[PDB]
Amino acid sequence: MNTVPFTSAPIEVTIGIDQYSFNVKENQPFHGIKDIPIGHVHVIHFQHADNSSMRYGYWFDCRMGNFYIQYDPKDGLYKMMEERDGAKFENIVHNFKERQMMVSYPKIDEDDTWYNLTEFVQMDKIRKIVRKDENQFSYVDSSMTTVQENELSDPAHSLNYTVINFKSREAIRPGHEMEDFLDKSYYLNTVMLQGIFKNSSNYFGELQFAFLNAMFFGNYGSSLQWHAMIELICSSATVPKHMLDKLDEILYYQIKTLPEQYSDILLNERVWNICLYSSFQKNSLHNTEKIMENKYPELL
Amino acid sequence: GAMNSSNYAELFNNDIKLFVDDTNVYRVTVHKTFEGNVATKAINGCIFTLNPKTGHLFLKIIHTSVWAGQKRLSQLAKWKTAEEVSALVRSLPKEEQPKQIIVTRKAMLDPLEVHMLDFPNIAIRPTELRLPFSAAMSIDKLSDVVMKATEPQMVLFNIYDDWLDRISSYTAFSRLTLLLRALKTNEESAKMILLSDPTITIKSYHLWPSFTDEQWITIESQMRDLILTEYGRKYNV
């Protein structure tokens, strides 16, 4: 069980830790989050009470270092930082725990929700999509644009998702125009899985990371990436049976977790209708189709 | 984006462009089988690819053999169209390649965009105009070469004959669209109007009769009359 201490909470803020969130008052004696499960990535996220615009946050793995949050009154945000002095850190965390100034990561024993949303998500892959190599944690916010969005502007602050474009030379073999456009199996299996991702695990990792950025920060480019990666699988006639079974599970937990009130902006009608009702895989996503029909029948 | 009544003069500027119409690519007769089921028999088709400025028509004849053993033919027809247009562009010298291709039907946009990925600078555009290019097979000499083809063939025409010696492209295109609209609305009446006077013939190297400027005004008037009548009929107004 790991801990992310906070130096202080000088400004009133809603703090998210994975799928949980807590209101903190201006100068409330809040000193951080304890009992964070080892074995998963996590995201700690912020929305200021005075600016319900700019959701921002930090992807991290407590196995990779000792991390804390400290408010920067110049840049006006809660910043993640690494403490290199292990004994200073243990001594800080022990004091704050003794004085019970920390919220406990509120995991229910039965509850596999966070595992099910992050199954294939790896910190090493996050750090390649979000490039800032001097830190072991990754900053994301609502406004960060994707490499693909920038092509259609600051590259240092971009989300480097794998570019997927159904009307690109990458996606379409010369003399297989109709075949490759109507059945994307070539693009999915040779170009993306064998060629770029290397395996279905890294592909699912990026898909799950894109969803989480869309849900937790309302990052529009992440939403586009999540939908593109779903549509590429659904639009392929030939997909390994283990990938379809796993995609059904991944999507089920994503749809289960989505705030009911955000379905209008986070779910693309065309993609979901195509994927569940027209696509090659229309009959392969039983769990996902049942939860979508029972939870968002309007969208369909 | 889309081509409409607002940006009409763009057709007659000095940027090479082509209209593509796929409406006569896949043509069938529907018939009863011996068992009393229904079946189609494909007949020869054509891609209608037209430079509206020059009148140059690239009539790609689609022989029924291209459908043999193929499924989902109405879908294939769009892709075969896009493949043939793409092959035509690649066959043209660079300075003759179009800067824009306008498809008469929106279902051609994705097939043509995908076949033309090698030509990122050629704009693929839909149109809001309801162009009567489906009536191309009502031009006797175009119908004859399609129906006699025993193999895939490209035949080059000037759909304006020698009109550009006397009128602008704008006017030549308006004449062409009025003739085709008439042929589309009432073929028999339109063909009667065009050939009623046997003294006016079609030159061997032409599609339409050799009308004087005065005789085109009369013809053009008779085609507008034909079109308004049929409209009153269709709609009881």
Coordinates of C-alpha atoms in Angstrom, one line a residue:
Chain A
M1 CA 0.0 0.0 0.0
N2 CA 1.6 3.3 -1.2
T3 CA 1.0 7.0 -0.3
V4 CA 1.1 10.3 -2.3
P5 CA 1.5 13.0 0.4
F6 CA 0.4 16.6 -0.3
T7 CA 2.5 19.5 1.2
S8 CA -0.8 21.5 1.6
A9 CA -4.1 22.4 -0.1
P10 CA -4.0 26.2 -0.4
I11 CA -6.8 26.4 -3.0
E12 CA -10.3 24.8 -3.0
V13 CA -10.2 21.8 -5.4
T14 CA -12.0 18.6 -6.3
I15 CA -9.3 15.8 -6.2
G16 CA -9.7 12.6 -8.2
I17 CA -7.8 9.4 -7.5
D18 CA -8.6 6.9 -10.3
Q19 CA -12.5 6.6 -10.3
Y20 CA -12.9 8.3 -6.8
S21 CA -13.0 12.0 -5.9
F22 CA -13.1 14.2 -2.8
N23 CA -13.8 17.9 -2.3
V24 CA -10.9 19.8 -0.4
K25 CA -11.6 23.3 1.0
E26 CA -9.1 26.3 0.7
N27 CA -6.4 25.7 3.4
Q28 CA -8.2 22.5 4.7
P29 CA -5.5 20.4 6.6
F30 CA -5.3 17.8 3.8
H31 CA -2.0 15.9 3.4
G32 CA -2.7 13.3 0.8
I33 CA -3.9 9.8 -0.2
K34 CA -2.8 6.5 1.4
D35 CA -3.5 2.8 0.9
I36 CA -3.0 3.1 -2.9
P37 CA -2.9 -0.4 -4.5
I38 CA 0.5 -1.5 -5.8
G39 CA 0.3 -3.3 -9.1
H40 CA -1.6 -0.7 -11.2
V41 CA -1.0 2.7 -12.8
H42 CA -3.0 5.4 -11.1
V43 CA -4.1 8.9 -12.0
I44 CA -4.5 11.8 -9.5
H45 CA -6.5 14.6 -11.0
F46 CA -7.7 18.1 -10.1
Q47 CA -10.5 20.6 -10.9
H48 CA -10.2 23.9 -9.1
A49 CA -13.5 25.2 -7.5
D50 CA -12.9 28.7 -9.1
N51 CA -12.2 27.3 -12.6
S52 CA -14.3 24.2 -13.6
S53 CA -12.2 24.5 -16.8
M54 CA -8.8 22.8 -17.1
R55 CA -9.2 19.4 -15.5
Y56 CA -5.5 18.2 -15.2
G57 CA -3.7 15.3 -13.6
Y58 CA -0.7 12.9 -13.3
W59 CA -0.4 9.3 -14.3
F60 CA 2.0 7.4 -12.0
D61 CA 3.1 4.0 -10.6
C62 CA 4.3 4.0 -6.9
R63 CA 6.7 1.2 -7.8
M64 CA 8.8 3.7 -9.9
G65 CA 9.5 6.3 -7.1
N66 CA 8.2 8.3 -4.1
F67 CA 5.7 10.9 -5.5
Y68 CA 4.1 13.9 -3.7
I69 CA 1.8 16.8 -4.7
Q70 CA 2.7 20.5 -3.9
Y71 CA 0.7 23.6 -5.0
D72 CA 2.8 26.0 -7.1
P73 CA 1.3 29.5 -6.5
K74 CA 3.2 30.9 -9.6
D75 CA 1.9 28.3 -12.2
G76 CA -1.4 28.0 -10.2
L77 CA -1.6 24.3 -10.1
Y78 CA -1.1 21.2 -8.0
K79 CA 2.2 19.7 -9.3
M80 CA 3.5 16.1 -8.9
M81 CA 7.1 15.8 -7.8
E82 CA 9.5 13.0 -7.0
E83 CA 11.2 12.9 -3.5
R84 CA 14.7 11.2 -4.1
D85 CA 15.4 11.1 -0.2
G86 CA 13.6 7.9 0.8
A87 CA 14.0 8.5 4.6
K88 CA 12.7 12.1 4.3
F89 CA 9.7 10.7 2.4
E90 CA 9.0 7.8 4.9
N91 CA 9.3 10.3 7.7
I92 CA 6.9 12.8 6.0
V93 CA 4.3 10.0 5.2
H94 CA 4.5 8.4 8.8
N95 CA 3.9 11.9 10.4
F96 CA 0.8 12.7 8.2
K97 CA -0.6 9.1 8.8
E98 CA -0.1 9.5 12.6
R99 CA -2.0 12.8 12.5
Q100 CA -4.6 11.1 10.1
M101 CA -4.4 14.0 7.6
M102 CA -4.8 11.6 4.7
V103 CA -7.8 10.1 2.8
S104 CA -7.7 6.3 2.2
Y105 CA -7.9 5.0 -1.4
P106 CA -11.5 3.7 -0.9
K107 CA -11.2 0.3 -2.7
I108 CA -14.1 -2.2 -2.0
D109 CA -12.6 -5.7 -1.7
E110 CA -15.0 -7.3 -4.4
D111 CA -14.4 -4.4 -6.8
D112 CA -12.1 -5.1 -9.9
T113 CA -13.2 -1.9 -11.7
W114 CA -9.8 -0.2 -11.7
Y115 CA -7.9 -3.4 -12.7
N116 CA -10.6 -3.9 -15.5
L117 CA -10.0 -0.3 -16.8
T118 CA -6.2 -0.4 -16.6
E119 CA -5.5 -4.2 -17.4
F120 CA -3.1 -3.5 -20.4
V121 CA -2.0 0.1 -19.4
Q122 CA 1.7 0.3 -18.6
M123 CA 3.6 3.4 -17.3
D124 CA 6.4 2.8 -19.8
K125 CA 3.8 3.1 -22.7
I126 CA 2.1 6.2 -21.1
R127 CA 5.6 7.9 -21.0
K128 CA 5.9 7.4 -24.9
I129 CA 2.5 8.9 -25.6
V130 CA 3.1 11.8 -23.0
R131 CA 6.8 12.8 -23.6
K132 CA 8.6 14.4 -20.6
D133 CA 11.4 12.0 -19.9
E134 CA 12.9 13.9 -16.9
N135 CA 9.8 12.8 -14.8
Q136 CA 8.6 9.2 -14.1
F137 CA 5.0 10.5 -14.0
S138 CA 2.9 11.9 -16.9
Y139 CA 0.8 15.2 -16.9
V140 CA -2.4 15.3 -19.0
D141 CA -5.1 18.0 -19.2
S142 CA -8.4 18.8 -21.0
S143 CA -6.8 21.0 -23.7
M144 CA -3.7 18.8 -24.8
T145 CA -4.1 18.0 -28.5
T146 CA -2.9 14.8 -30.2
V147 CA -0.1 14.4 -32.9
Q148 CA -3.0 13.6 -35.4
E149 CA -5.0 16.8 -34.4
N150 CA -1.8 18.9 -34.8
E151 CA -1.4 17.6 -38.5
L152 CA -5.0 18.7 -39.4
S153 CA 0.6 22.9 -32.5
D154 CA 3.2 22.7 -29.7
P155 CA 4.8 19.2 -30.0
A156 CA 6.3 19.1 -26.5
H157 CA 2.7 19.2 -24.9
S158 CA 1.1 16.8 -27.4
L159 CA -0.5 13.3 -26.8
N160 CA 1.5 11.0 -29.2
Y161 CA -1.2 8.4 -29.8
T162 CA -0.6 6.0 -32.7
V163 CA -2.1 7.8 -35.8
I164 CA -5.0 5.8 -37.3
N165 CA -6.4 7.1 -40.6
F166 CA -8.8 4.8 -42.7
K167 CA -8.1 7.0 -45.9
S168 CA -4.3 6.9 -45.8
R169 CA -1.7 5.0 -47.9
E170 CA -0.8 3.2 -44.5
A171 CA -4.3 1.8 -44.3
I172 CA -4.8 0.9 -48.0
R173 CA -2.5 -1.4 -50.2
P174 CA -2.2 -0.3 -53.8
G175 CA -4.6 -2.5 -55.9
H176 CA -6.5 -3.6 -52.7
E177 CA -8.4 -0.2 -52.4
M178 CA -11.9 -1.6 -52.1
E179 CA -10.9 -4.7 -50.1
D180 CA -8.8 -2.8 -47.5
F181 CA -11.3 0.0 -47.1
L182 CA -14.3 -2.3 -46.5
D183 CA -12.3 -4.9 -44.5
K184 CA -9.6 -3.3 -42.4
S185 CA -8.0 -6.7 -41.4
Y186 CA -4.8 -5.9 -43.2
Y187 CA -4.5 -2.5 -41.4
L188 CA -5.4 -4.0 -38.0
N189 CA -3.3 -7.3 -38.2
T190 CA -0.2 -6.5 -40.4
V191 CA 0.3 -2.7 -40.1
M192 CA -0.9 -2.0 -36.5
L193 CA -0.6 -5.2 -34.5
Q194 CA 2.5 -7.0 -36.1
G195 CA 4.0 -3.6 -37.4
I196 CA 3.6 -0.9 -34.7
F197 CA 2.0 -2.2 -31.5
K198 CA 3.8 -5.6 -31.7
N199 CA 1.0 -7.4 -29.8
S200 CA -2.8 -6.9 -28.8
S201 CA -1.7 -6.0 -25.2
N202 CA 0.0 -2.7 -26.2
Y203 CA -2.9 -2.0 -28.6
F204 CA -5.5 -2.5 -25.7
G205 CA -3.2 -0.5 -23.4
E206 CA -3.3 2.6 -25.7
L207 CA -7.1 2.1 -26.2
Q208 CA -7.7 2.0 -22.4
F209 CA -5.4 5.0 -21.8
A210 CA -7.2 7.0 -24.5
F211 CA -10.6 6.2 -22.9
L212 CA -9.4 7.2 -19.4
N213 CA -8.0 10.6 -20.7
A214 CA -11.4 11.2 -22.5
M215 CA -13.4 10.4 -19.3
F216 CA -11.2 12.0 -16.6
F217 CA -10.1 15.2 -18.5
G218 CA -12.8 15.5 -21.3
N219 CA -9.8 15.3 -23.7
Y220 CA -11.5 15.4 -27.1
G221 CA -8.5 14.0 -29.0
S222 CA -8.3 11.0 -26.6
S223 CA -12.0 10.4 -27.3
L224 CA -11.2 10.4 -31.1
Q225 CA -8.4 7.9 -30.5
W226 CA -10.5 5.5 -28.3
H227 CA -13.3 5.5 -31.0
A228 CA -10.7 5.0 -33.9
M229 CA -9.1 2.0 -32.1
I230 CA -12.6 0.4 -31.5
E231 CA -13.7 1.0 -35.1
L232 CA -10.5 -0.5 -36.6
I233 CA -11.2 -3.8 -34.8
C234 CA -15.0 -3.8 -35.5
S235 CA -14.3 -3.0 -39.2
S236 CA -11.9 -6.0 -39.6
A237 CA -13.5 -9.3 -40.8
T238 CA -10.5 -11.3 -39.4
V239 CA -9.7 -10.7 -35.7
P240 CA -8.1 -13.2 -33.3
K241 CA -11.0 -14.7 -31.1
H242 CA -9.0 -13.8 -27.8
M243 CA -8.9 -10.1 -29.0
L244 CA -12.7 -10.0 -29.6
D245 CA -13.5 -11.7 -26.2
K246 CA -11.1 -9.2 -24.5
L247 CA -12.4 -6.1 -26.4
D248 CA -16.0 -7.0 -25.2
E249 CA -14.7 -7.1 -21.5
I250 CA -12.6 -3.8 -22.0
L251 CA -15.6 -1.9 -23.5
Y252 CA -18.1 -3.3 -21.0
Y253 CA -16.1 -1.8 -18.0
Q254 CA -15.6 1.5 -19.9
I255 CA -19.4 1.8 -20.6
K256 CA -20.2 0.7 -17.0
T257 CA -17.9 3.4 -15.5
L258 CA -18.8 6.4 -17.8
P259 CA -20.9 9.0 -15.9
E260 CA -24.5 8.6 -17.2
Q261 CA -24.6 12.4 -17.8
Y262 CA -21.5 12.5 -20.1
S263 CA -22.8 9.8 -22.7
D264 CA -23.9 12.7 -25.0
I265 CA -20.2 14.2 -25.5
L266 CA -18.0 11.0 -24.8
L267 CA -19.8 8.5 -27.1
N268 CA -19.8 8.8 -30.9
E269 CA -23.3 7.7 -32.2
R270 CA -21.9 6.7 -35.7
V271 CA -19.1 4.5 -34.4
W272 CA -21.2 2.7 -31.7
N273 CA -24.2 2.0 -34.1
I274 CA -21.7 0.8 -36.8
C275 CA -19.7 -1.3 -34.3
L276 CA -22.7 -3.1 -32.6
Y277 CA -25.2 -3.3 -35.6
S278 CA -23.4 -3.0 -39.1
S279 CA -19.8 -4.1 -38.6
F280 CA -18.2 -7.6 -39.1
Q281 CA -18.1 -7.8 -35.3
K282 CA -21.8 -6.8 -34.7
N283 CA -22.4 -10.2 -33.0
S284 CA -19.0 -10.5 -31.2
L285 CA -19.5 -7.9 -28.4
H286 CA -22.3 -9.5 -26.3
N287 CA -21.5 -7.9 -23.0
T288 CA -20.9 -4.4 -24.5
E289 CA -24.1 -4.6 -26.7
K290 CA -26.2 -5.6 -23.6
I291 CA -24.8 -2.8 -21.4
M292 CA -25.1 -0.1 -24.1
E293 CA -28.7 -1.1 -25.0
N294 CA -29.7 -1.1 -21.2
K295 CA -27.8 2.1 -20.3
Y296 CA -27.8 4.3 -23.5
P297 CA -30.6 3.1 -25.7
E298 CA -31.2 6.8 -26.8
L299 CA -27.7 6.9 -28.5
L300 CA -28.7 3.8 -30.6
Chain B
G1 CA -16.5 21.4 -50.7
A2 CA -19.7 20.9 -52.7
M3 CA -20.4 22.5 -56.1
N4 CA -23.7 24.4 -56.4
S5 CA -25.6 27.3 -58.2
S6 CA -23.5 29.8 -56.1
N7 CA -20.0 28.7 -57.5
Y8 CA -21.2 27.7 -61.0
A9 CA -18.7 29.9 -63.1
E10 CA -15.9 27.8 -61.5
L11 CA -16.6 25.1 -64.1
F12 CA -15.5 27.4 -66.9
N13 CA -12.2 28.7 -65.4
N14 CA -8.7 27.5 -66.4
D15 CA -8.3 24.9 -63.6
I16 CA -8.6 21.5 -65.3
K17 CA -11.6 19.6 -63.8
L18 CA -13.7 16.6 -64.6
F19 CA -17.2 15.5 -63.8
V20 CA -17.6 11.8 -63.1
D21 CA -21.0 10.2 -63.4
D22 CA -21.3 6.5 -62.4
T23 CA -25.1 6.1 -63.1
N24 CA -24.6 4.0 -66.3
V25 CA -21.7 1.9 -65.0
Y26 CA -23.8 -1.0 -63.7
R27 CA -26.9 -1.6 -66.0
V28 CA -29.3 -4.6 -65.8
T29 CA -32.5 -5.9 -67.3
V30 CA -34.8 -7.5 -64.7
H31 CA -36.6 -10.7 -65.9
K32 CA -38.6 -13.8 -64.7
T33 CA -36.8 -17.2 -64.6
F34 CA -38.4 -20.4 -65.7
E35 CA -39.3 -21.2 -62.0
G36 CA -41.0 -17.7 -61.8
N37 CA -38.2 -16.1 -59.7
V38 CA -36.6 -12.8 -60.8
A39 CA -33.0 -12.5 -62.1
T40 CA -30.9 -9.6 -63.6
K41 CA -28.9 -9.7 -66.8
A42 CA -26.1 -7.1 -66.9
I43 CA -25.7 -5.1 -70.1
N44 CA -22.6 -3.0 -71.1
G45 CA -22.2 0.2 -69.1
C46 CA -20.0 3.3 -69.2
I47 CA -18.3 5.9 -67.0
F48 CA -19.1 9.4 -68.1
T49 CA -16.1 11.5 -67.4
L50 CA -16.4 15.1 -68.8
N51 CA -14.2 18.2 -68.9
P52 CA -17.0 20.9 -68.8
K53 CA -14.6 23.6 -70.2
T54 CA -13.3 21.7 -73.3
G55 CA -16.2 19.2 -73.9
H56 CA -13.7 16.3 -73.8
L57 CA -15.6 13.1 -72.8
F58 CA -13.6 10.1 -71.7
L59 CA -16.2 7.4 -72.2
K60 CA -14.9 4.2 -70.4
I61 CA -17.0 1.3 -71.6
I62 CA -17.8 -1.3 -68.9
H63 CA -18.1 -4.7 -70.5
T64 CA -20.4 -7.2 -68.7
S65 CA -17.4 -9.5 -68.2
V66 CA -16.1 -7.3 -65.4
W67 CA -19.1 -8.4 -63.2
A68 CA -18.6 -12.2 -63.8
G69 CA -18.3 -14.1 -60.5
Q70 CA -18.5 -10.8 -58.5
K71 CA -20.9 -10.1 -55.5
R72 CA -22.6 -6.9 -54.3
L73 CA -22.3 -5.4 -57.9
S74 CA -23.9 -1.9 -57.1
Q75 CA -21.1 -1.5 -54.5
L76 CA -18.4 -2.9 -56.8
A77 CA -19.5 -0.5 -59.6
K78 CA -18.6 2.5 -57.4
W79 CA -15.0 1.1 -56.8
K80 CA -14.6 0.0 -60.5
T81 CA -15.6 3.6 -61.4
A82 CA -13.0 5.0 -59.0
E83 CA -10.3 2.5 -60.3
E84 CA -11.0 3.5 -64.0
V85 CA -11.0 7.3 -63.2
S86 CA -7.7 6.8 -61.2
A87 CA -6.2 4.8 -64.1
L88 CA -7.3 7.7 -66.5
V89 CA -5.6 10.4 -64.4
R90 CA -2.4 8.3 -64.2
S91 CA -2.5 7.9 -68.0
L92 CA -2.6 11.7 -68.6
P93 CA 0.5 13.8 -68.7
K94 CA 0.9 15.9 -65.4
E95 CA -0.1 19.2 -67.1
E96 CA -3.4 17.5 -68.3
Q97 CA -4.3 15.9 -64.9
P98 CA -7.4 17.5 -63.3
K99 CA -7.0 19.8 -60.2
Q100 CA -10.6 18.8 -59.2
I101 CA -12.9 15.8 -59.8
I102 CA -16.6 16.4 -59.2
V103 CA -18.7 13.3 -58.6
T104 CA -22.4 13.6 -59.5
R105 CA -23.3 11.2 -56.7
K106 CA -22.0 11.4 -53.0
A107 CA -21.6 7.6 -52.9
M108 CA -18.5 8.0 -55.3
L109 CA -16.6 10.3 -52.8
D110 CA -15.0 7.6 -50.6
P111 CA -14.2 5.1 -53.5
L112 CA -12.6 7.9 -55.5
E113 CA -10.8 9.5 -52.5
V114 CA -9.2 6.1 -51.6
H115 CA -8.2 5.3 -55.3
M116 CA -6.6 8.8 -55.6
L117 CA -4.6 8.8 -52.3
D118 CA -1.5 9.0 -54.6
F119 CA -2.9 12.4 -55.7
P120 CA -3.4 14.4 -52.5
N121 CA -3.5 17.7 -54.4
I122 CA -6.5 16.6 -56.6
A123 CA -9.7 17.7 -54.8
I124 CA -12.6 15.2 -54.8
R125 CA -15.9 17.2 -54.6
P126 CA -19.6 16.4 -54.5
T127 CA -22.2 18.7 -56.2
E128 CA -25.6 20.1 -55.1
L129 CA -26.5 20.3 -58.9
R130 CA -28.9 17.6 -60.2
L131 CA -27.0 17.0 -63.5
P132 CA -28.8 14.9 -66.1
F133 CA -25.6 12.9 -67.2
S134 CA -27.7 9.6 -66.7
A135 CA -29.3 10.5 -70.1
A136 CA -25.8 10.1 -71.9
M137 CA -27.1 6.7 -73.1
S138 CA -29.9 8.6 -75.0
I139 CA -27.2 10.0 -77.3
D140 CA -27.4 7.5 -80.2
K141 CA -23.7 7.4 -81.0
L142 CA -22.7 6.9 -77.3
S143 CA -25.4 4.2 -76.8
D144 CA -24.1 2.4 -80.1
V145 CA -20.4 2.2 -79.0
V146 CA -21.3 0.9 -75.5
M147 CA -23.7 -1.8 -76.8
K148 CA -21.3 -3.0 -79.5
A149 CA -18.3 -3.3 -77.2
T150 CA -17.0 -6.9 -76.9
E151 CA -14.2 -5.9 -74.5
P152 CA -13.3 -3.1 -72.1
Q153 CA -12.6 0.1 -74.2
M154 CA -12.0 3.8 -73.7
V155 CA -13.6 6.1 -76.5
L156 CA -12.9 9.8 -76.6
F157 CA -15.6 12.3 -77.8
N158 CA -16.2 16.1 -77.8
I159 CA -19.7 16.2 -76.3
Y160 CA -20.0 19.9 -77.6
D161 CA -19.1 19.0 -81.3
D162 CA -17.8 22.3 -82.8
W163 CA -20.0 24.6 -80.6
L164 CA -17.0 26.2 -78.9
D165 CA -16.0 27.8 -82.3
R166 CA -19.2 30.0 -81.8
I167 CA -20.2 30.0 -78.1
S168 CA -18.5 30.0 -74.7
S169 CA -18.1 26.9 -72.5
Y170 CA -20.7 28.3 -70.1
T171 CA -23.3 28.5 -72.9
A172 CA -22.1 25.1 -74.4
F173 CA -22.6 23.4 -70.9
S174 CA -26.1 25.1 -70.5
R175 CA -27.0 23.7 -74.0
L176 CA -25.7 20.2 -73.1
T177 CA -27.6 20.2 -69.7
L178 CA -30.8 21.4 -71.4
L179 CA -30.6 18.7 -74.2
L180 CA -29.9 15.9 -71.6
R181 CA -32.6 17.2 -69.1
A182 CA -35.1 16.9 -72.1
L183 CA -33.8 13.4 -73.2
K184 CA -34.1 12.3 -69.5
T185 CA -37.7 13.7 -69.0
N186 CA -39.2 12.5 -72.4
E187 CA -36.7 10.8 -74.6
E188 CA -39.0 10.1 -77.6
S189 CA -40.2 13.8 -77.7
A190 CA -36.6 15.1 -77.3
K191 CA -35.3 12.8 -80.1
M192 CA -38.3 13.9 -82.3
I193 CA -37.4 17.6 -81.6
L194 CA -33.7 17.0 -82.6
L195 CA -34.3 15.1 -85.9
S196 CA -37.8 16.3 -87.2
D197 CA -36.2 18.3 -90.1
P198 CA -34.2 15.7 -92.2
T199 CA -32.2 18.6 -94.0
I200 CA -30.2 19.1 -90.7
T201 CA -27.9 16.1 -90.3
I202 CA -25.3 14.9 -87.8
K203 CA -21.8 15.0 -89.2
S204 CA -20.0 11.6 -89.0
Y205 CA -17.5 13.2 -86.5
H206 CA -20.3 14.8 -84.3
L207 CA -23.0 13.6 -81.8
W208 CA -25.7 16.3 -82.4
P209 CA -27.1 17.9 -85.6
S210 CA -25.5 20.7 -87.5
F211 CA -27.9 23.5 -86.3
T212 CA -27.3 27.2 -87.3
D213 CA -27.3 29.7 -84.4
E214 CA -30.9 30.6 -85.3
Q215 CA -32.0 26.9 -85.4
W216 CA -30.3 26.2 -81.9
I217 CA -32.5 29.0 -80.4
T218 CA -35.7 27.3 -81.8
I219 CA -34.4 23.8 -80.7
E220 CA -33.5 25.2 -77.2
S221 CA -37.0 26.8 -76.9
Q222 CA -38.7 23.5 -77.9
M223 CA -36.7 21.6 -75.2
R224 CA -37.7 24.1 -72.4
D225 CA -41.4 23.7 -73.6
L226 CA -40.9 19.9 -73.4
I227 CA -39.4 20.1 -69.9
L228 CA -42.2 22.5 -68.4
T229 CA -45.1 20.4 -69.9
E230 CA -43.7 17.1 -68.5
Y231 CA -43.3 19.0 -65.1
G232 CA -47.0 20.1 -65.2
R233 CA -48.0 16.5 -66.1
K234 CA -45.7 14.8 -63.4
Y235 CA -47.1 17.1 -60.7
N236 CA -50.7 18.2 -61.9
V237 CA -49.8 21.9 -61.7

